[PDB]
Each structure stands twice: as structure tokens, then as C-alpha cells.
């Protein structure tokens, strides 16, 4: 109980320091200087070199290390890209290294569907659009998005679960705070038809809480209870309907959530 008591005292001291007249004035003074500095360098940012230099340093792979892309900012980035961009014994063993494997068959199939497909190209699309879109819809109970993305089997599991929440008169309003480790874990063939699938894993920080529909009070979870969940998705691409605006052929066959633990 000492740790809980210390946390309240530490929060109270920080709150008192933040709410202190000197602290509030100091915080306001620091904020004002930062705003002026950004405005001062704003014309510098307008220079074509700054875009050239920033794209050199950042380039957008900083998203590998975390960060959640807001739904609105997620749509504009995809729309803008779509408008312009997206529009002896050793030798025998060494030979077996270069030989065709099951993962080689899976990636080759997806390359016929889309000549631009690659492990690094799809992982960027997963990291930037697909995973944030699905995870945000999953925690917020957005069945309209999941209907397009999920297959018949995982969606019927989701709709069955969301049905239970209806007779409890509760609705899900969760948040995704940060998505990490978005990667293609494995590429396997689904027996016995050898359906090529991509197993995708990710780790996301989230707040899972439910509110009563009629009033809005808390019914489950907590307003401030961050969890480090692990999500496992199995992806396949339909050779047909690859011209879909939203999913462009991708379809989730399995969606598993596990390994949730507290985080901060």
C-alpha cells in the first residue's frame, strides 16, 4: 500500500507544482517561447530544402518505433498517396538454401496479384494504414469497417460478441494509444488447398472500457488503464476485387488477441 500512497503523494505534489502560480506562469512562459520559435522558423520550413532534408532524415520509417496515426490523418495520407504516388556436402546444403520453400511460394503468389508487392512494401502499408484502421475499429466497435476487412468467420465471432453487449446496454469506446512491432511474422500455406496467407503480429497500447448506452457511466474497464496487448492477424488477398478502394483485395481470415498486460 506504500507504493499506492506514494503515487498519490507524487501526483499531488506534481499537480500542486503544475497548479502553482509560479509553475503556471513558468509553464505559460515556456509555451509562449516555443510557439514564437516555431513561427520564426516557419518560413524556413517552407523552403524546398527543408522538405528535402526532412525526407532524408525521417522518410517516414520512424513509425516502426511506435505512434498511433489518427483516423482523420490516416485517411488523408492514404488519399494523398493514392492521388499521386499509389496511382560436396556443403554445396548440397548451400544449394538447399537457394531452393524454393513454402514461404517462397506464398510471397511469389502475392507478387503475381500485385507486381509492387514485397515484404517491406506490405509491412509499410500494414504499419501505416491497415493495422491502425482495424485495431481502432476493433476497440471502438466499428462493425462497418470490420465487415469490409474481416472474413465471414472472424466477423461472425465479432458480431456475436458485440450482440452480447447490446442486451447489456453497453457500447465500446476504447482508444488505441500506440502500435508497435507491426511485422509479417510468418508466411504459410493453408492446407489442404495451399491457400497463401501472411501471419501478421503487432503490439498495441489500448484502453478497454465500456459505457452504458443510456447514461454513459463506466460499465467495464477503467478510464485510465493502459494495456499492452498482442494481436495476431492472418491475411490473404482475393485475386478478384483487387480494385476495392478500401481493402484492395486484402482480407483477414483470423484475428486473435492475447498477451494483454498492464503498461504505462
Amino acid at each position, epitope marked *: 500500500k506504500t507504493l499506492k500512497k506514494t503515487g498519490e503523494t507524487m501526483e499531488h505534489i506534481a499537480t500542486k507544482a503544475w497548479e502553482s502560480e509560479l509553475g503556471k506562469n513558468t509553464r505559460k512562459a515556456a509555451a509562449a517561447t516555443a510557439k514564437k520559435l516555431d513561427e520564426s522558423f516557419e518560413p524556413v520550413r517552407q523552403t524546398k530544402i527543408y522538405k528535402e532534408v526532412s525526407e532524408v532524415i525521417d522518410d517516414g520509417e520512424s513509425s516502426r518505433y511506435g505512434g498511433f496515426i489518427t483516423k482523420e490523418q490516416r485517411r488523408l495520407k492514404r488519399e494523398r498517396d493514392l492521388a499521386s504516388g499509389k496511382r560436396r556436402k556443403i554445396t548440397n546444403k548451400v544449394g538447399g538454401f537457394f*531452393a*524454393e*520453400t*513454402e514461404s517462397s*511460394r506464398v510471397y511469389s*503468389q502475392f507478387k*503475381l496479384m500485385d507486381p509492387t508487392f514485397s515484404n517491406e512494401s506490405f509491412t509499410r502499408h500494414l504499419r501505416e494504414y491497415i493495422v491502425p484502421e482495424i485495431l481502432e475499429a476493433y476497440v471502438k466497435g466499428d462493425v462497418k469497417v470490420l465487415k469490409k476487412w474481416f*472474413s*465471414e*468467420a472472424p466477423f461472425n465471432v465479432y458480431a456475436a460478441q458485440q450482440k452480447i453487449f447490446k442486451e447489456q446496454d453497453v457500447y465500446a469506446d476504447g482508444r488505441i494509444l500506440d502500435i508497435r512491432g507491426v511485422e509479417i511474422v510468418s508466411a504459410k*500455406l493453408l*492446407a*489442404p*488447398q*495451399d*491457400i*497463401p496467407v501472411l501471419v501478421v503480429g503487432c503490439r498495441a497500447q489500448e484502453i478497454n472500457l465500456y459505457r452504458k448506452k443510456k447514461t454513459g457511466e463506466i460499465a467495464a474497464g477503467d478510464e485510465a488503464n493502459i494495456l499492452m496487448s498482442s494481436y495476431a492477424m492472418v491475411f*490473404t488477398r*482475393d*485475386p*478478384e476485387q483487387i480494385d476495392d478502394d478500401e481493402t484492395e483485395g486484402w*482480407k483477414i*481470415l483470423e484475428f486473435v488477441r492475447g498477451g494483454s498486460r498492464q503498461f504505462t
Partner: antibody, heavy 117, light 111 residues
């Protein structure tokens, strides 16, 4: 490239056994599987059994008591065998490698088998 | 199990026009929304040659004039424009469940 060779005997005596060896080349039996398909002129194409990519077999329910499909990874060979044959078992027997979406993409040259005396 | 009925049993069309072959399945052949219908072509003295797999995908090296369509239980193969070479026996084969079953075959000829 990928190429499947069959080595089986024609003119099988009635109530005897037919054995066909499908020697594959250009791919490994570990990563690909081989179907066994029959084409009678009075019954058309019909599927007998499959040597799955994983290494298990599955047979047609009408031939399950007679069929026997075994493979050998080292020699790249698939072995087919029917215990008893009659006049209606006269057809051309194909071994077909299957790929993604169970596409029988490569086929053997076929083994025309006649059951007579 | 899954009986594939193929129509018509025979067909004769002139060069340059479209030849349509239909396959109708007793059940549905869908797994995960993908229809596992394959189309084969067999010349008289040769093994069957795969044309279409997963109901719409050209086989390796298949000319673009072969097209697969359909979903549910109704499937079709279209040859257009037809050439002199592609006169053969055409089969539809499902791969949803064992046993794999083939269609009756459609003899497609020239006028």
C-alpha cells in the same frame, strides 16, 4: 524445369496389382504435393488419391480399400498402387503436382493401363 | 460428393468469336470467399493442361484469351478470340473438398 516422369506397366492382368512410379524433377516432394488422377473413356477424369504436401495421403472413398500411395523424399519419387484391378480399371493414370489453390499445374505423361489377357 | 455439371456437352464456333463453357456445381466451392474452381484443357493425346485456377487466375504461360468467371455454384470459361489451336476437351475441376471431382468435359470445335 518442373517435369514429372511416370514408369508403370501396361497390360495388367485382371485381379492383379498396378504399380506406377512418378519421378519428379525441378521441385522437391517436401514443398509440393502430387495428385493421382485417372481418365477412363467411359467415366472421364476421376481423382484417385493425393500425396499431400505435408506428407499424408488421402484417397477416393471408392478406391480407399485398394489404393496405396507412398513417396520417397530422397529419390524424388511417388509410388502408386492398386491392390486389385478389373476391366473397368482400364484408363490412363496421371500424377499431377498441385500448387497454390490446389492447381494441378504440372502433369505426368500418363500411363495407359489395359486390364485384359 | 460435389457433382460438377458442365454445359454444353459439345460446342462448335468459328475463329475469332467467343466460346463460352459453363460449369455448375451441386454445392458451393467457396473457402474464405475464394471459389476453388479450376479449368483444364486436354488435347486428344496429351495430359490435361491447367488454364484457370481459383476461378479467375491464368495458369503459368496460359494465353490471355482464356478467362474464368462465376462464383457460388455457377462458373464459366470464355475463349475470345478463339484461335485454330485451342480446339480440345475442356474440364472444370473443384478443389473445395475431397474427393476432387471433374466435370464431364466439353468438346469444343471449329466451324
Amino acid at each position: 524445369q518442373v517435369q514429372l516422369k511416370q514408369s508403370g506397366p501396361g497390360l495388367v492382368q485382371p485381379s492383379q496389382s498396378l504399380s506406377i512410379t512418378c519421378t519428379v524433377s525441378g521441385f522437391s516432394l517436401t514443398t509440393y504435393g502430387v495428385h493421382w488422377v485417372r481418365q477412363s473413356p467411359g467415366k472421364g477424369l476421376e481423382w484417385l488419391g493425393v500425396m499431400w504436401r505435408g506428407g499424408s495421403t488421402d484417397f477416393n472413398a471408392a478406391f480407399m480399400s485398394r489404393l496405396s500411395i507412398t513417396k520417397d523424399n530422397s529419390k524424388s519419387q511417388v509410388f502408386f498402387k492398386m491392390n486389385s484391378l478389373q476391366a473397368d480399371d482400364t484408363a490412363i493414370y496421371y500424377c499431377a503436382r498441385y500448387g497454390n489453390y490446389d492447381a494441378m499445374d504440372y502433369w505426368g505423361q500418363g500411363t495407359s493401363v489395359t486390364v485384359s489377357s | 460428393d460435389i457433382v460438377l455439371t458442365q454445359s454444353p456437352a459439345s460446342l462448335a464456333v468459328s475463329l475469332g468469336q467467343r466460346a463460352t463453357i459453363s460449369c455448375r456445381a451441386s454445392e458451393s466451392v467457396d473457402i474464405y470467399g475464394i471459389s476453388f474452381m479450376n479449368w483444364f484443357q486436354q488435347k486428344p493425346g496429351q495430359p490435361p493442361k491447367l488454364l484457370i485456377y481459383a476461378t479467375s487466375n491464368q495458369g503459368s504461360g496460359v494465353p490471355a484469351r482464356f478467362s474464368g468467371s462465376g462464383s457460388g455454384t455457377d462458373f464459366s470459361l470464355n475463349i475470345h478470340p478463339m484461335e485454330e489451336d485451342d480446339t480440345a476437351m475442356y474440364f472444370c475441376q473443384q478443389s473445395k473438398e475431397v474427393p476432387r471431382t471433374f466435370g464431364g468435359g466439353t468438346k469444343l470445335e471449329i466451324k
